[PDB]
Amino acid sequence: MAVLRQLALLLWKNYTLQKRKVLVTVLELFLPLLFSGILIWLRLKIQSENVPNATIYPGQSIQELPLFFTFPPPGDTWELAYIPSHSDAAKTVTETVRRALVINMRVRGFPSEKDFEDYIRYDNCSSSVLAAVVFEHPFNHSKEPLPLAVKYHLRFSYTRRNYEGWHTTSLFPLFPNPGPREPTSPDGGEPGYIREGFLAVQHAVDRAIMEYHADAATRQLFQRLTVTIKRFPYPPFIADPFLVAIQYQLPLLLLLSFTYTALTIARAVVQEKERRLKEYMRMMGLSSWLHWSAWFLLFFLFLLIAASFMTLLFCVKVKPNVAVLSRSDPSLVLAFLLCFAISTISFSFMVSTFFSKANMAAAFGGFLYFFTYIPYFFVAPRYNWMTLSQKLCSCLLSNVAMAMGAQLIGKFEAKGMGIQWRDLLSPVNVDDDFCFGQVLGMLLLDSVLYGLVTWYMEAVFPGQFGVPQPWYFFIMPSYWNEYFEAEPEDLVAGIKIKHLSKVFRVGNKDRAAVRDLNLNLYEGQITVLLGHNGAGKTTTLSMLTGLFPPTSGRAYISGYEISQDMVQIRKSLGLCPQHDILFDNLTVAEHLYFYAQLKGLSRQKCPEEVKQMLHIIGLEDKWNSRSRFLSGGMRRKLSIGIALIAGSKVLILDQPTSGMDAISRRAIWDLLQRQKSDRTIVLTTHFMDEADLLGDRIAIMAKGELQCCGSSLFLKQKYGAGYHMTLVKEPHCNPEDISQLVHHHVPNATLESSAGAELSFILPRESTHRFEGLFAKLEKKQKELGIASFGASITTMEEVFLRVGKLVVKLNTGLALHCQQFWAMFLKKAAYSWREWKMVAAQVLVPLTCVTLALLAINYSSELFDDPMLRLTLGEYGRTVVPFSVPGTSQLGQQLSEHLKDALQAEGQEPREVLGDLEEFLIFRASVEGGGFNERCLVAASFRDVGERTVVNALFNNQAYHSPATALAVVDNLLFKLLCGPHASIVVSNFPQPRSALQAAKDQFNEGRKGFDIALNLLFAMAFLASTFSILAVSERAVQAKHVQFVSGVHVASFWLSALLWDLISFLIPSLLLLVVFKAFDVRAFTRDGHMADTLLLLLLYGWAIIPLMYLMNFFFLGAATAYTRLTIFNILSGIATFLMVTIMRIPAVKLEELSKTLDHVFLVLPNHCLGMAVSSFYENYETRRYCTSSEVAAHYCKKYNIQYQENFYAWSAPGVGRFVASMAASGCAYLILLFLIETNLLQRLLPEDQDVADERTRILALLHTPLIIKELSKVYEQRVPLLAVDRLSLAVQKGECFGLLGFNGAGKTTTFKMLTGEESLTSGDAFVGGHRISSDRIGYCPQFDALLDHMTGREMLVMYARLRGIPERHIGACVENTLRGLLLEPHANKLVRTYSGGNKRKLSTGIALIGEPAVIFLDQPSTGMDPVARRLLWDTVARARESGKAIIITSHSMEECEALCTRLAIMVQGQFKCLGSPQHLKSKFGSGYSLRAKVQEALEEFKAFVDLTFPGSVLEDEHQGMVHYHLPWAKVFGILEKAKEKYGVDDYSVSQISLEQVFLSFAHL
Ligand SMILES: Nc1ncnc2c1ncn2[C@@H]1O[C@H](COP(=O)(O)OP(=O)(O)OP(=O)(O)O)[C@@H](O)[C@H]1O
Ligand SMILES: Nc1ncnc2c1ncn2[C@@H]1O[C@H](COP(=O)(O)OP(=O)(O)OP(=O)(O)O)[C@@H](O)[C@H]1O
């Protein structure tokens, strides 16, 4: 029941996410209609004729040869032959035949048929033979007589001889058009059969047989009757030349409308597992088959609306009874489209499981969809030769199975009835056995076949974020030291780690991340894991939670062996990652509700729980606000809320409180204290008071190995000595002054590190007596040496970490500046094709296999074979009916009709007397029966007499090919039977002659579709190649690595021209690899006289005109993968769709050619259309020029009909590419201009507060040496409820200073930096940096969130910014080493900044903002994920950069740096300042410069008595069950605690001058 209660949850989530992008949804829901509207518009344009009256034809006469064979061929006379030559009968028959055909002819003779075939194809005196009678009889010893039952062939020519062959491969034309097959020519048609004298010779031989058998009765017979042949009259019809036009590319219009959802599904499924959003929901509890179901139900509704709109505008009558698919029962069309939609969803699901990156999934799942359709180019021509097995074997691809259904829809449509639910098992004609149900069967078998592949790949090859399974997973039935403390035996071990390890694949050396871990974490207490930046701590936690498998070892979360069955562990797991994983466009209460329901919590008690969590975390006013906005410190709060909601037995937190203010860290600490009773908790943290306040056992990792493990006291009394003391010096101070005094008073002590203004000391316990003197000595003389805010404590935790770690120039400008900024960007872009070589592979191979498989299917479909033998008899068609009439009541007419009646019934046919004027009966039945009349009535007879002489008409249905011969054979059969015995028949066959070798080398015309196919398969390749030039340009702006580059001062021309130049170089390679292909296949129009350069010019000119456009179009998008799949469809609409429409709309048969001019003039502004038409015209012009020049015999024919070719190849006139070249050349310039006009913002114009805060608003309002000036600055975010983020924020900073700018979470800091730099827009304010105003018109920038290029390494990212700011090439190695070494990045100097750590990216992002020595510097939380050792080096760098006169404005949350390197603090809340002045000013506000902090109900209450009766006037606050904090109103308070510990029950204490954090907390209740 939970499964159905969770499927509804997933569906609700998908519906909510879709509801908030309606423009995108409506847009992509009506893209499939721009391909099916082409047809519904063409159907209004093209019109019918409706011929009203029937068509009649006159008879012929087959007594003699046509009036063309009386003239002998040039050179000799006509020649005749017979195959059995060793028999006298076979010669005496042919002699009679020769006499009958009264011309000059000569006979021959051969010993077999093989000799005749060779003489035809291996000689030159041949090719004058007329026919060749072949008798199929054994014929012993030249004395055998002709049997009663004779049969023979007639070998006629292979070419149309009487001014395509004989079509003996089929009985009906493949695709028939309405009206008579040959409207004129009342003598037959395409195979002729009367022009070539087939009927004449056949009748002569049929009479020769009778003259041989009787010779006396046959003369008396053939003196009173003659046989003549007529044609059926055709009924009235309508003309409508529509279906014939759109028949070859109906499948290409059905595929090209589902293509978009095909390449949307593939990347929408992959970029939500590349984003770690699938592993996250699986970790929190989610069945993997409830996700596929949600995806399927999401993507089936779209294709159900689209498949209904297509069915709607495939059946509605636009004009009375005219609609597309004029009669096809819309139900079955809809069923076909649904059966295609299911399959094209399953195919995308299967494809998406081969890729792990959304870019390659989008670039290779839109290509595989079309790649699956290519083998139809080899099936369409040779469809009449395949077998049913070979037709079902090629239906295993869904696109081919759709193509061979869209073919039958046309074939059934242009015949009669169409598609009707009662023909699912009956083929079209009597020649192919292929039903329509066999298409729907394979289209539904393919879905299952693809599902069985997506079920296996998703389980054995999970990619980069899953934990795999063995290759046989379906077989089993269960699928369906002395630094280390001594472990406690009073607890239960939750997690047990044993010899765990992990090795990565950097370079070729197998560097290790974790190595041989051993640990045990117990239930009911918190274990804190410490370490520096890059020593496990996330590889361990990502391996305990199943994000990727261990290299070796094992671990037992609850006895479950994480590598064996983690599906049981993930029932009670709950975690928060280092970088949050949230849904944009999904509010906060929605997030909490969804993730409480997912885990299992009941629906009754959910809302109160969500309210409790919203109150706890602190997100109250941010309720129902989208996660995309938030702040930066609220993201972590929401993540923690999600992690703790619904309860969990195992909590795994990875840096939870990183980026929050203190007032909320305390609340998080309190909750974690209250929720550790009966669960295990694992923490990784970088604040060293957190690891002491809330921690029962602590572990520290050096470089993948465990250093120490134990409680918080055993560790302190092993590494420190006795105590600690810290100081903060003033500007004019010297360390030796303090050091010598300390040595003279306290001998044994060692300075730790003077990291800025810290200058700390370490003292042992053996010198505890000499404390008061040294304390008073510095108490009295604070001002002399400049010590502000001194403090002392007892061996804090921050020192144990240090002990463990230690134990183991004139800048370029002018020309040389631009020549350097250009080279830097050129290398930045070029190093992107070296690191992701999959993209360059897709750029070089995709455009090539689409052309080498279209030139391969053009050579293949251009060959003829043999014209097999056909048996000309009724009975090849089935059970036909054969009407006849005998009007005239005369003898010899009924005694023939009775023979006709009996012979057919013996054959198996059905006669039908009419008695009533055969012609009108035929016309009426042909109009009432419909299209089924052509399959059951094919011959007829009428026995009429004219003046004592009988005339036998032999009608034939010309809708079939071989009807005349069949009719004449039926007549001659009964004629032979009349005068001989009833067992006497004649059987005739065609079997034409074979083609020779000399006559098979004519091949003059080749235009046909041979240029159209090349130009179409080039467009389908350049649609995919040309979309890859916007991937880097979008992914470099989504990360906001472009905003920092422009802040650092890159000229726009330098940014864009180098990108254009590298893209042109990258585009040149396929344009040079296409020439090799055109040479290999010997395509003449692009290989001959000088056209090799003219083709490359076309390709390079298209590459010049599309590349600037793919830069303009990239401004819409925010994602790199979701821009490929929309630019690809933009390149198809403006390409193939229009080219396909214009080619159809210029056929002579359809009477609309003039409109294809006013459309072709509009489509010139589209750069994809121009290339296709240019290639097509270049191909057509070469052929029409090579034909009107070969000989004068064709030169006059060319001007007979005005073939109209060009000699220039570049003229303006039609068959010359002048205007296409002009329009492609004038588009690149018009796009570069428009891009440079938009990149330079030229198309953009087209209350009693504190006194000190109020004084700054006047000192600047009532300045040449000030780098930065802010006055009356404001910012409002309008969201139907305006939110004021900045309120007048007036202030000014001078040189050599360090402004503080503190605040709470979400107050104003980042949104201030944005306006200062230029990211966001201004409203009612002004400011000046470096003097020059920013409201109208050398600074560094370290943004809050890392904006780095993942394909570059650490040192290259620094070299780029060294080049962007002068720094001559000579003096650059020193300037890079000084920044890598002085920031502790030497180990990671060149390691591809994509595999860096959480803090190893903050180090680099800070090092970028300081290299080059800029004037102003904007730091924005520079140190969040940095450990103490590196956080101290950051302070040294910031101080040494400020002592050299540079304005600096940091923005941080920790306080020990805000007092170690700051000079003018400012606490701002709700978007306005509340205090300014030096930190000493703030601290000496209300005096009482003494504080305390102890650490241990009854014990604390008793220990409060001592400090209450000893320190009256206490204002104590903020206790943490031991952390009672005292703000007393120096050697007189440290000496007190020299005996009050034995009877006070404490272990540590810190007494110091008043804390800055207390001043900060004083503003809390506001
Ligand atoms: N996908 C990866 N490919 C190659 N090496 C990696 C990959 N991920 C991490 N590493 C390396 O393995 C080591 C593991 O570091 P890890 O990220 O676990 O440290 P961390 O504790 O998360 O750092 P921080 O304290 O900043 O959070 C790092 O030195 C890192 O360089
Ligand atoms: N793009 C935006 N659209 C609408 N509102 C926003 C946007 N960005 C921030 N806000 C809102 O305006 C306020 C300003 O947030 P700001 O960026 O100053 O937070 P912050 O002080 O940088 O947080 P932290 O210092 O913890 O990172 C926030 O409370 C936030 O809710």
Ligand SMILES: *[C@@H]1O[C@H](CO)[C@@H](O)[C@H](O)[C@H]1NC(C)=O
């Ligand atoms: C072609 O035929 C002629 C006579 O018809 C003959 O003289 C000539 O040799 C033949 N060609 C060849 C190559 O033998």
Ligand SMILES: *[C@@H]1O[C@H](CO)[C@@H](O)[C@H](O)[C@H]1NC(C)=O
């Ligand atoms: C003569 O023809 C018959 C066929 O009727 C055949 O069986 C026989 O072999 C032939 N005679 C000889 C000598 O082969």
Ligand SMILES: [Mg+2]
């Ligand atoms: Mg980490």
Ligand SMILES: [Mg+2]
């Ligand atoms: Mg911020």
